[PDB]
Design a protein around this ligand. Structure first.
Ligand SMILES: [Mg+2]
Ligand SMILES: [Mg+2]
Lengths: 155, 155
């Protein structure tokens, strides 16, 4: 019902090494579909916690939903969530597919440069319209590269 | 005139080591007074760039204002800003004083634990009223621990 009520989280990667980064932590807000992308060296509990402490400095989600990935099912992650009163669920898929498709296209001719281009992927994702919705994720949350990205998202 | 038009940035630290973190990058939005706090190991250009890439994934500021700190005056930082079309200025002070005062009080009895408490400092800062303004920074941006913090901010 509210932004920041529920996060859906997942790892994408590995990608070609880029400034030592190999993975992207994907966080999708349930209500708005707003996506945060965090580059990490590993798909680990500690990188997940690092990124999510940054995000939860804005607001604390009631629920976090993920898959059974090792980053998410550790007792360290469980402890972190319990300390904050966060309910963890395990088992938006369209959103995650979109992101993967975006990343693949952007690697072409420049595989080591994805870290630098990452902020523009996120900007693109949050300022593009979904098939059935009338507003962008950015609008819902706050009340050439860009062209190529929009190609993948709109076609 | 707009949120994300201008950032004011600065380093606070060093603080007692906490999960390997020694410093806090402080980013204050000019229009809303909204503050982001990023923990770093060093007051460096690379930690500044890492944190600001995360933030500029939301929107790209027109201007960034800082002091003459080495993190900010390097040609690496200058290059990063020019690539994004960001105008750098060198030479809110009340805001930064508030934060320092907050951090000092929170160290007492628990100096190594500041990293874990950092998100609550930011939450507190953005969801507290300023002396002359009618809205919190959070409201402007989005359209016991907490009690102790509010003590420092309101007294
Ligand atoms: Mg997965
Ligand atoms: Mg300074």
């Amino acid at each position: 019902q509210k932004p920041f009520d529920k996060f859906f989280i997942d790892y994408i990667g590995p990608l070609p090494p880029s400034q030592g980064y190999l993975y992207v932590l994907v966080v999708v807000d349930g209500m708005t579909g707003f996506t945060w992308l965090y580059p990490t060296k590993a798909p680990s509990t500690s990188a997940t916690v690092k990124s999510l402490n940054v995000l939860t400095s804005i607001a604390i989600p009631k629920v976090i939903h993920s898959d059974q990935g090792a980053a998410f099912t550790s007792s360290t992650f469980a402890e972190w969530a319990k300390e904050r009163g966060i309910h963890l669920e395990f088992s938006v898929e369209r959103k995650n597919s979109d992101i993967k498709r975006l990343l693949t296209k952007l690697l072409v001719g420049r595989p080591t440069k994805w870290y630098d281009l990452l902020p523009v992927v996120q900007l693109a994702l949050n300022n593009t319209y979904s098939p059935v919705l009338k507003y962008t994720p950015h609008q819902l949350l706050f009340g050439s590269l860009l062209q190529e990205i929009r190609t993948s998202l709109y076609h």
